[PDB]
């Protein structure tokens, strides 16, 4: 509503079509279908959902569907629910787990669920944006999946809008270049002969870590 | 709470040819250029429009240099409409003039890929099957408006055997990628001005001929430069047919080129005769693409220290001081970096092989 | 004045004598225009005169003016000459001596000017090209310091006599160093090749004063022009006048010679480019710019030689003198003082552009345009008052008489200013007598 | 169809109370395609119930255009989704191995006058020059002569053999400009007629015979 | 900053010059060498920035040739005389190859020009032109290589001037027409030097103002590969661009059948 009143959302609609989900799943499915059709019709379609909505639960994105995923802040659960408070108290009294730590873990799990569905393989590349200064916190940042946290370069930590746009342009241009599956051989893809190499087996063993 | 202390005292301290396969001997290339608001962006200095059109002029010059028997058409998509900026012809001067005029255009609206593709297909509908139909599209904006379903147009183009290649500017488009893959063309993304020039140079070379490509024995004529002397009684000045098409009064030339099939007079070659449809070409024009028939294979690179032989280049007699030495496969000569680059790029022939 | 301008004003005999030197012919051909070069090459083996119409038909109609310029230059230099071709035609034929010497130089034959100085073998005290260049710089630095008047520069008296004859420095009081005039200041503000060229032109204009053969000196200079830098040549084979001129050049630093009795001499790059004058040497690798100009009209010099310090102080107020830095300020007072001394604004601007620091070279303008414009305005301030002495005629009773007298004055070329509306005019005092006599005679005829 | 037909198109305010609508038909058609309700209202009201300008003023003043709190946010979201859905709905409504490469060695160039010399004696002649220029000295006088120079000048002189032909005649002034324009028109007409004639050729159907006869 | 380069290629075919010597004509190989050396000396004489490159075109290979007279000119003449004598005295006919390696010499000259241009500083522009003298007969097998050299020269925009002595060559005419160079056959060989000075010596800017003989008319007829006869209109192959006078179902060169239904 504030975007519409300010008029900024009008230019956003001018650039790409806008689709916003509602509480009714019947019309939400139609909106998602329209978004997918627009994305397959060459016209920009933008989806605005919640981390607890149906989109984050059972919707999967193809490479051309998960190009850009932006999380607006850490999705902390509404604390006014006494059920949540009682559960936090019980966990603290039975597992010595602080309520703030559990809330941060749940919010980071929801964020990773929302963003982790934008990649479908090596040939799939997508953009991840976290528009919040709170993610810069070490405790909050450390609660990210290892395969995602490892690629989280510190040079991208707490950027601005223009810097984020420039980095997105660079990443898109670099990753939109033509690529061959033969290049993946020996580095990220293994053939039948590469499996028999003992050095490859040692590298595979070093890849995984147990905790 | 950073006001507690701040000092910089410590800062003050002392310190790519394919196989021997059939290619595009006959080409009918159409260029699609975006004219949306995104062309005003300054990704390429000074803006996308000026650099893009300068590189387009360079591409046209190189394409006419390497493909004398090809055709160039220019289509500009602006305000969700398609405009045939330049007629499909082989004249480089007209194309350069049109591009220079379009340099000072206005970039507004959104691109209309569907309309431009439909217009190109309509123009290329009447073209013979043996001639290759090639489409180049410049896509600045990432969104386009189509009055109808584009997939039906994609199927129609696939049935029409038309090659479509798209060189995007911002990022990869899934729809454009699918269209290029189905049409047999290649999709590329611009990294910078140098990358754009490299992509244009790569696209200058004819694409390999597919299985569906036809093989017909086309008939062509090669008229001489008939020049009439006013001293002789057989001097008949006549206006050129091509010059008649312009609003300016054609120049009454004493001689020129006359069509052997219908005595049509033209002052420019290689230009296909408009009357009988005969393609009036010249012997150098045909031989201008012979280098594609026999590409120059890359020479073996052996460093100077590991090469115990002549210290002077075989091509320029220069002393071999480079860290790398290029040796031919056939005659096993010695070529420096400059000579090897020039031969592979321009000469396409080895002097020792000629000997 | 370029080389050809001085050559074109020479007598026919001097030109004919110079034509006997193949090196002189080579230099003359090199100094000709491209069309003139083509014409000379065409006529190199032509033993018959060429009709003028046939020569004129070679060039385009549009390039006739350029063709006429080349023809006039060739005629003035006496490279060719006109002959009464049989049948009334006026053929054009090259100078036989000039043509023969050109053929000798190009096709071969004749005799070498230098007798292969390798006969003496390698030089025991041979120098290096950088050393020769530095010595050439040092000698001219000494000459300039002496012109300034610093006691550190002591030169021969006859060298100062040349300057006195040149008019750069006038010896108003004998015994004391001469005071350098405005012409001397203009000479100092010129670039070093320009200074050398002007000095040599002045020497040539008074060459007959020393009893030195002009033809021999010019031919020797031309031979030195094509000489190889870092290579010695034979002193022997030259007249005593030529030996004295060579010693003078050694005093100038253009020629290196360890001892006056030495049989070897090394020409320098300055002497090589001396014949070309100011042009030709477009790639002069001079000293790096040490002068930095700031928007507050402040100059910072990374120099220590007193010559540049004096040059800067000629038109600026010195502020600080560091061991490796000199800080001065550009002021209107100093600029006006320099202008009163005879210094023009363009000389200062060109000199500052020559000494432009590499940091300032990064800017698209070499110097701040505002500073240059301020200097130009200061220069224009001095000549606001225009003084022109003359005689005023203002008592014209008839317009016809005024028009007639004005026409007569313009015929005489003595008119200074005219005012037809008020029937007023100004004439030169020298031409006043003639106009007065004409006016009186007109009344007498009336 | 672009979604900017509403946001970018605004009531233009001039200097002194001027409502420069600039109601181009292109924008009206886009609105009708996106909003069939507007077309229905126009059909049921214009020009009987209300004028077109009055209808546009009502639309500007209605809540339909000025959509601008949970109910308001839901209404805005529904309007945007409906607009997007309507826009989407209306958007639809061979390896080569040559045999004889020597043809490229001697291409369109016809058979030349390549003549082979005599038998081994030629080698002896090859020896002669080899012995002739083995002891060679440069020469200067023998290069050119005055007679040869005069002959070369005469050949290069205007009107000579080398100076082929000369000046020509101004054909432009000989033919009047009106006659030139008439000739251009006749050339264009004849060229078009002959292009139509040759278009039928080659004649593969009986209809082409009649068409060519009519063209003749 | 105007650097004018005049590359001279000399047809050093021993057969033609030996035949000419047998004819006992007034003009010999010595006169040709003297004329070439004089022309190069004049080219270097007209300006310091001018540069000269001389390459000898011989059947065996292409040879890079380069007292009151100028030191540099004398040194250049001595080097040229030494190189030509070394080539000719060691030029032994071993094989039936009679046509001179014209294409290889042109390629080497182009490589030398490219190397010089790379070595040329950005402060100066190096204008380049090539003059070639034709004495023996033309080469047919070098046609494709000659055309490739022509295209590269036109791409680099280098003038190519041809000086025919005895046998005309339409290939040289086409090269001069395309590259913009000058083609002319010298009728009097002893006068040849003047033809070099009067016509070929001036640069293209100088040639513009000077009035020069009109260029020779050049035709572009084609030979029909089935019989190598000149034709006006021919059937061009869409696969290998082979030209045939009569319609054929299968091309002889590319071995591809013409699928015309
Ligand atoms: Zn025709
Ligand atoms: Zn090389
Ligand atoms: Zn090779
Ligand atoms: Zn074929
Ligand atoms: Zn045939």
Backbone angles phi, psi at B220, to 5 degrees: -135, 155
What's chain A look like in SS3? CHHHHHCHHHHHHHHCEEEECCCCHHHHHHHHHHHHHHHHCCCCEEEECCCCCCHHHHCCCCCCCCCEEEECCCCCCCCCCHHHHHHHHHHHHHHCCCHHHHHHHHHHHHHHHHHHHHCCCCCCCCEEEECCCHHHCHHHHCCCCHHHHCCCCHHHCCCCHHHHHHHHHHHHHHHCCCCCHHHHECCCECCHHHHHCHHHHHHHHHHCCCC
What are the residues facing A68 on neighbouring strands?
Answer: A127
**Whose CA is closest to C286, among C199, C193, C363, C362?**
C193
Whole-number Å distance, alpha carbon E123 to ligand 1 midpoint, is 51
Q: Is the separation of the CB atoms in D194 and B263 below 8 Å?
A: no
Nearby residues for ligand 3 (ion, Cβ within 5 Å)? B 328, 330-331, 350, 352-353
Q: Is the separation of the CB atoms in E242 and E254 below 8 Å?
A: yes
Distance, in Å, from the CA atom of B322 to the CA atom of B318, rounded to the nearest integer, reads 10
Chain E interface, best mutation among B316, B321, B345, by max E CB count within 10 A? B316
Residue C61 is given by DSSP the state S
Provide the angle, in degrees to the nearest 10, between the axes of the packed helices B150-160 and B113-125.
30
Query: In the CATH hierarchy, which fold is given to the domain comprising A1-184?
Result: Rossmann fold (3.40.50)
Backbone angles phi, psi at D88, to 5 degrees: -65, -40
After which residues is the backbone of chain E broken at C–N > 2.5 Å?
A: 66
CB < 8 Å to A43, chain B = 143-145
**Which residue is it, tokens 């049935």?**
B159
Assess whether chains C and A touch, using the rule of 3 or more C-beta pairs within 8 angstroms. no
**In chain E, positions 170-189, which contact chain D (CB-CB < 8 Å)?**
170-171, 184, 187-188
**Which residue is it, tokens 């405790």?**
A139
What's E161-196 look like in SS3? EEEECCCCCHHHHHHHHHHCCCEEECCCHHHHHHHH
**Which residue is it, tokens 């003023």?**
D57
What sign has the CA pseudo-torsion C213, C215, C216, C221? positive
Q: Give the distance, in angstroms, between the CA of residue D104 and the centroid of all CA atoms in the same chain.
A: 33
Evaluate whether residue E78 is within a structural domain: yes
> Could you give the 3-state DSSP secondary structure of residue C62?
coil
> Could you give the 3-state DSSP secondary structure of residue E64?
strand
Neighbours of A53 (CB within 10 A): 16
Cis amide linkage into residue B46, ω under 30° from 0? yes
> Could you give the 3-state DSSP secondary structure of residue E197?
helix
Distance, in Å, from the CA atom of E151 to the CA atom of B288, rounded to the nearest integer, reads 7
Query: Per-domain residue ranges for chain A?
Result: 1-184
Cis amide linkage into residue D47, ω under 30° from 0? yes
Residues 6+ apart with CB under 8 A from B54: none
Provide the angle, in degrees to the nearest 10, between the axes of the packed helices C34-42 and C64-76.
70
Distance, in Å, from the CA atom of C239 to the CA atom of C106, rounded to the nearest integer, reads 26
Neighbours of A152 (CB within 10 A): 14
Q: What's the CA angle centered on D62, arms D56 and D66, to 5 degrees?
A: 105
CB < 8 Å to B275, chain E = none
**Whose CA is closest to C168, among C151, C150, C187, C191?**
C187
> D166: exposed, middle or buried (C-beta count within 10 Å: 0-12, 13-18, 19+)?
exposed
Domain count of chain E? 1
Resolution (A): 7.1
B330 touches chain D (CB under 8 A): no
Distance, in Å, from the CA atom of B105 to the CA atom of B79, rounded to the nearest integer, reads 13
Backbone angles phi, psi at A188, to 5 degrees: -125, -10
Cis amide linkage into residue C137, ω under 30° from 0? no
**E231 to chain D nearest CA, in Å?**
9
Distance, in Å, from the CA atom of E77 to the CA atom of B74, rounded to the nearest integer, reads 57
**D201 to chain E nearest CA, in Å?**
16
Q: How many CA atoms lie within 13 A of B124 on its CB side?
A: 30
**Which residue is it, tokens 């101004």?**
D170
With b for 16 or more beta-carbon neighbours within 10 A and e for fewer, the D10-34 pattern comes to: eeeeeeeeeeeeeeeeeebebbbbb
What tokens were used for C292?
């930095």
Q: What would you report as the CA-atom Rg of chain C, rounded to the nearest whole angstrom?
A: 28
Residue C118 is given by DSSP the state G
Whole-number Å distance, alpha carbon B299 to ligand 3 midpoint, is 8
CA dihedral A23, A27, A28, A31 (to 10 degrees): -140
**Whose CA is closest to C266, among C120, C133, C115, C139?**
C133
Evaluate whether residue E23 is within a structural domain: yes
Evaluate whether residue E102 is within a structural domain: yes
Neighbours of D192 (CB within 10 A): 12
Q: Is the separation of the CB atoms in D77 and A20 below 8 Å?
A: yes
Largest CA distance in chain B: 105
Helix (H) or strand (E) holding B150: helix B150-160
Residue B346 is given by DSSP the state I
- The shares of helix, strand and coil residues in chain C, as percent rounded to the nearest 5, are 50, 10, 35
Whole-number Å distance, alpha carbon B29 to ligand 4 midpoint, is 23
CB < 8 Å to D140, chain C = 103, 107-109
Provide the angle, in degrees to the nearest 10, between the axes of the packed helices E29-46 and C96-107.
110
Distance, in Å, from the CA atom of A164 to the CA atom of C425, rounded to the nearest integer, reads 80
Backbone angles phi, psi at C14, to 5 degrees: -65, -45
What tokens were used for B56?
């387009």
Evaluate whether residue E118 is within a structural domain: yes
What are the residues facing A70 on neighbouring strands?
Answer: A129
Whole-Å CA distances, C407 to C389, D161, E172: 21, 59, 69
Among the partner residues D72, D73, D84, nearest to A18 by beta-carbon distance? D84
Which ranges of C156-262 does DSSP label H, i.e. alpha helix? 157-166, 182-189, 192-205, 214-225, 240-252
Residue C228 is given by DSSP the state P
Closest residue in chain D to residue E184, using alpha carbons only = D162
Residue E48 is given by DSSP the state S
Helix (H) or strand (E) holding C267: strand C264-267
Distance, in Å, from the CA atom of D43 to the CA atom of C438, rounded to the nearest integer, reads 102
Whole-Å CA distances, A118 to A62, A69, A113, A124, A147: 7, 7, 10, 8, 14
Among the partner residues C54, C103, C107, nearest to D157 by beta-carbon distance? C54
Residues of the domain holding E20: 3-202
Distance, in Å, from the CA atom of A134 to the CA atom of A139, rounded to the nearest integer, reads 10
What sign has the CA pseudo-torsion E202, E206, E211, E217? positive
Distance, in Å, from the CA atom of B251 to the CA atom of B244, rounded to the nearest integer, reads 9
Distance, in Å, from the CA atom of C436 to the CA atom of B213, rounded to the nearest integer, reads 102
Tell me which method was used to determine the 3D structure: cryo-EM
Residues 6+ apart with CB under 8 A from A86: none
Size of chain B, expressed as the number of residues it contains: 355
Cis amide linkage into residue B335, ω under 30° from 0? no
Neighbours of E123 (CB within 10 A): 8
Residues 6+ apart with CB under 8 A from A166: none
Q: Give the distance, in angstroms, between the CA of residue A123 and the centroid of all CA atoms in the same chain.
A: 17
**B146 to chain D nearest CA, in Å?**
7
Task: Please enumerate, as own/partner, the contacts of E234-238 that have beta carbons within 8 Å and a separation of 24 or more.
Answer: E234/B219, E234/B220, E234/B221, E234/B222, E235/B217, E235/B218, E235/B219, E235/B220, E236/B217, E236/B218, E236/B219, E236/B220, E236/B286, E237/B217, E238/B25, E238/B26, E238/B130, E238/B214, E238/B215, E238/B216, E238/B217, E238/B218
Whole-number Å distance, alpha carbon E229 to ligand 5 midpoint, is 7
Helix (H) or strand (E) holding E229: strand E229-231
Distance, in Å, from the CA atom of B332 to the CA atom of B334, rounded to the nearest integer, reads 7
Neighbours of E55 (CB within 10 A): 25
Residues 6+ apart with CB under 8 A from B159: none
Residues 6+ apart with CB under 8 A from A51: A71, A75, A110, A111, A113, A114
Pairing of strands C298-301, B265-266: unpaired
Distance, in Å, from the CA atom of C355 to the CA atom of C316, rounded to the nearest integer, reads 15
**Whose CA is closest to B261, among E231, C329, D8, D16?**
E231
Write the DSSP string, B310-335.
-SB-TTT--B--SSEEEE-SSS---B
Cis amide linkage into residue E238, ω under 30° from 0? no
């Amino acid at each position: 509503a504030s975007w519409y009143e300010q008029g900024i959302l009008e230019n956003i609609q001018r650039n790409k079509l806008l689709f916003i989900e509602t509480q009714d799943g019947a019309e939400t499915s139609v909106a998602l279908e329209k978004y997918q059709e627009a994305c397959e019709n060459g016209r920009g379609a933008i989806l605005l959902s919640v981390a607890r909505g149906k989109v984050s639960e059972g919707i999967d994105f193809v490479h051309h569907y998960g190009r850009a995923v932006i999380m607006f802040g850490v999705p902390y659960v509404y604390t006014q629910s006494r059920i949540l408070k009682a559960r936090l108290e019980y966990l603290r009294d039975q597992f010595q787990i602080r309520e703030n730590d559990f809330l941060t873990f749940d919010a980071m799990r929801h964020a990773a669920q929302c963003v982790g569905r934008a990649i479908r393989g090596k040939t799939d590349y997508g953009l991840m944006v976290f528009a919040d200064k709170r993610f810069a916190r070490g405790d909050k940042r450390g609660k990210l999946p290892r395969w995602i946290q490892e690629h989280l370069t510190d040079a991208n930590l707490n950027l601005t809008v223009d810097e984020g746009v420039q980095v997105a342009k660079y990443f898109l241009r670099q990753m939109a270049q033509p690529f061959h599956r033969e290049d993946q051989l020996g580095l990220s893809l293994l053939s039948l002969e590469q499996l028999e190499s003992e050095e490859t087996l040692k590298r595979i063993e070093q890849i995984a870590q147990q905790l | 709470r950073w006001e507690g202390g701040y000092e910089r005292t410590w800062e003050i301290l002392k310190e790519e040819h394919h196989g021997q396969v059939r290619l595009g001997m006959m080409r009918h290339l159409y260029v699609v250029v975006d004219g949306s608001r995104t062309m005003e962006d300054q990704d390429l200095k000074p803006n996308r429009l000026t650099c893009t059109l300068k590189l387009l002029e360079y591409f046209v010059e190189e394409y006419f240099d390497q493909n004398p028997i090809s055709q160039i058409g220019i289509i500009v998509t602006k305000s969700k409409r398609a405009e045939k900026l330049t007629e499909l012809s082989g004249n480089p001067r007209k194309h350069i003039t049109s591009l220079k005029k379009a340099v000072d255009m206005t970039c507004h609206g959104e691109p209309s890929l569907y309309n431009s593709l439909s217009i190109a297909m309509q123009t290329l509908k009447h073209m013979p099957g043996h001639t290759s139909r090639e489409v180049l599209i410049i896509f600045s904006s990432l969104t386009t408006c189509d009055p109808s379903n584009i997939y039906d147009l994609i199927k129609t183009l696939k049935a029409a055997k038309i090659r479509v290649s798209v060189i995007g500017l911002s990022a990869e488009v899934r729809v454009c990628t699918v269209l290029a893959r189905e049409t047999g063309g290649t999709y590329h993304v611009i990294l910078d001005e140098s990358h754009y020039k490299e992509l244009l140079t790569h696209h200058v070379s004819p694409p390999p001929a597919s299985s569906s490509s036809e093989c017909s024995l086309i008939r062509m004529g090669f008229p001489q430069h008939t020049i009439a002397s006013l001293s002789d009684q057989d001097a008949k000045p006549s206006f050129s047919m091509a010059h008649l098409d312009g609003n300016t009064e054609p120049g009454l030339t004493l001689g020129g080129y006359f069509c052997p099939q219908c005595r049509a007079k033209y002052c420019e070659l290689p230009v296909e005769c408009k009357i009988c449809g005969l393609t009036l070409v010249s012997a150098p024009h045909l031989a201008r693409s012979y280098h594609h028939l026999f590409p120059l294979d890359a020479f073996q690179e052996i460093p100077l220290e590991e090469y115990n032989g002549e210290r002077f280049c075989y091509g320029c007699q220069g002393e071999l001081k480079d860290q790398h030495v290029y040796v031919c496969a056939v005659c096993q000569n010695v070529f420096c970096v400059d000579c090897d680059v020039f031969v592979h790029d321009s000469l396409h022939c080895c002097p020792g092989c000629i000997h | 004045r370029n080389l050809q301008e001085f050559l074109g004003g020479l007598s026919p005999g001097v030109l004919d004598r110079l034509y006997g030197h193949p090196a002189t012919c080579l230099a003359v051909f090199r100094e000709l225009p491209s069309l003139a070069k083509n014409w000379v090459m065409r006529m190199l083996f032509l033993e018959q005169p060429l009709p003028q119409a046939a020569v004129a038909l070679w060039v385009k109609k549009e390039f006739s003016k350029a063709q006429e310029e080349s023809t006039g230059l060739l005629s003035g230099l006496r490279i060719w000459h006109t002959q009464l071709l049989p049948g009334g035609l006026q053929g054009l034929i090259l100078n036989p001596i000039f043509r023969q010497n050109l053929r000798i130089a190009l096709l071969g034959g004749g005799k070498a000017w230098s007798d292969d100085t390798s006969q003496l073998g390698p030089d025991k005290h041979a120098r290096d090209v950088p050393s020769l260049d530095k010595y050439a710089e040092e000698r001219w630095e000494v000459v300039l310091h002496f012109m300034v008047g610093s006691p550190s520069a002591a030169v021969s008296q006859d060298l100062a006599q040349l300057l006195s004859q040149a008019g750069l420095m006038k010896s108003t009081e004998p015994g004391e160093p001469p005071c350098i005039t405005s012409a001397g200041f203009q000479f100092l503000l010129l670039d070093t090749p320009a200074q050398l060229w002007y000095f040599m032109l002045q020497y040539l204009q008074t060459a007959q004063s020393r009893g030195m053969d002009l033809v021999e000196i010019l031919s020797f200079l031309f031979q030195l022009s094509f000489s190889t830098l870092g290579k010695d040549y034979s002193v022997e084979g030259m007249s005593d006048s030529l030996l004295n001129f060579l010693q003078h050049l050694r005093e100038f630093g253009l020629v290196f010679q360890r001892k006056r009795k030495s049989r070897r001499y090394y020409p320098t790059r300055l002497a090589i480019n001396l014949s070309s004058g100011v042009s030709g040497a477009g790639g002069t690798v001079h000293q790096p710019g040490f002068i930095v100009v700031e928007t507050n009209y402040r100059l910072y010099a990374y120099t220590e030689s007193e010559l540049q310090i004096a040059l800067i102080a000629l038109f600026s107020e010195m502020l600080y003198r560091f061991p490796n830095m000199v800080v001065a300020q550009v002021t209107r007072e100093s600029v006006q003082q320099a202008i009163a001394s005879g210094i023009t604004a363009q000389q200062i601007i060109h000199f500052l552009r020559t000494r432009a620091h590499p940091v300032m070279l990064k800017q698209t303008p070499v110097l701040p345009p505002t500073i240059t414009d301020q200097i130009r305005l200061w220069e224009l301030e001095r000549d606001r008052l225009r003084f022109t002495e003359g005689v005023l005629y203002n008592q014209f009773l008839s317009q016809v008489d005024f028009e007639l007298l004005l026409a007569h004055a313009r015929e005489l070329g003595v008119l200074v200013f005219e005012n037809s509306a008020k029937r007023l005019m100004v004439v030169t005092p020298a031409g006043h007598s003639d106009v007065k006599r004409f006016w009186k005679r007109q009344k007498h005829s009336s | 169809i672009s979604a900017a037909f509403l946001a970018d198109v605004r009531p233009q305010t001039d200097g002194c109370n001027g409502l420069r609508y600039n109601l181009t038909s292109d924008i009206i058609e886009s609105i009708f395609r996106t909003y069939p309700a507007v077309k229905m209202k126009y059909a049921e009201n214009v020009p009987h119930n209300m004028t077109e300008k009055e209808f546009w003023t009502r639309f500007f003043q209605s809540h339909y255009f000025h959509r601008d709190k949970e109910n308001s946010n839901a209404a805005i979201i529904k309007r945007f989704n409906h607009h997007s859905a309507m826009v989407l709905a209306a958007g639809l409504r061979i390896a080569l191995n040559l045999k004889k490469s020597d043809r490229y060695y001697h291409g369109p160039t016809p058979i030349q006058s390549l003549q082979y010399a005599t038998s081994q004696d030629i080698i002896n002649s090859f020896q002669s020059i080899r012995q002739e220029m083995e002891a060679y000295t440069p020469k200067l006088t023998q290069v050119l002569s005055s007679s040869a120079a005069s002959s070369t000048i005469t050949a290069l002189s205007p009107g000579g053999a080398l100076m082929q032909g000369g000046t020509q005649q101004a054909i432009n002034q000989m033919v009047p400009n009106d006659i030139q324009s008439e000739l251009k028109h006749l050339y264009v007409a004849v060229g078009e007629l002959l292009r139509h004639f040759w278009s039928c050729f080659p004649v593969n159907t009986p209809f082409l015979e009649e068409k060519v006869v009519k063209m003749k | 900053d105007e650097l004018n380069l005049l590359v001279i290629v000399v047809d050093a075919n021993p057969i033609w010059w030996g035949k000419q010597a047998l004819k006992e004509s007034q003009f010999t190989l010595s006169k040709c060498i003297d004329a070439v050396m004089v022309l190069g000396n004049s080219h270097l004489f007209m300006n310091r920035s001018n540069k000269l490159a001389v390459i000898a075109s011989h059947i065996q290979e292409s040879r890079f040739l380069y007292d009151g007279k100028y030191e540099l000119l004398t040194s250049a003449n001595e080097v040229i005389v030494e190189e030509i004598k070394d080539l000719m005295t060691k030029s032994d006919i071993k094989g039936q190859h009679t046509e001179t390696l014209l294409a290889g010499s042109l390629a080497k000259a182009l490589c030398y020009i490219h190397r010089m241009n790379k070595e040329v500083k950005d402060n100066q522009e190096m204008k380049s032109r090539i003059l070639v003298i034709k004495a023996a007969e033309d080469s047919a097998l070098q046609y494709m290589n000659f055309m490739n050299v022509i295209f590269a020269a036109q791409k680099q925009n280098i003038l190519i001037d041809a000086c025919v002595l005895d046998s005309d060559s339409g290939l040289l005419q086409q090269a001069c027409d395309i590259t913009g160079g000058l083609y002319l056959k010298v009728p009097q060989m002893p006068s040849l030097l003047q033809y070099l000075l009067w016509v070929f010596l001036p640069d293209q800017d100088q040639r513009s103002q000077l009035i020069l003989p009109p260029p020779v008319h050049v035709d572009y007829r084609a030979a029909c590969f089935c019989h190598r006869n000149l034709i006006e209109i021919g059937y061009v192959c869409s696969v290998c661009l082979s030209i045939f006078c009569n319609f054929s179902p299968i091309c002889t060169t590319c071995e591809t059948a013409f699928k015309i239904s």
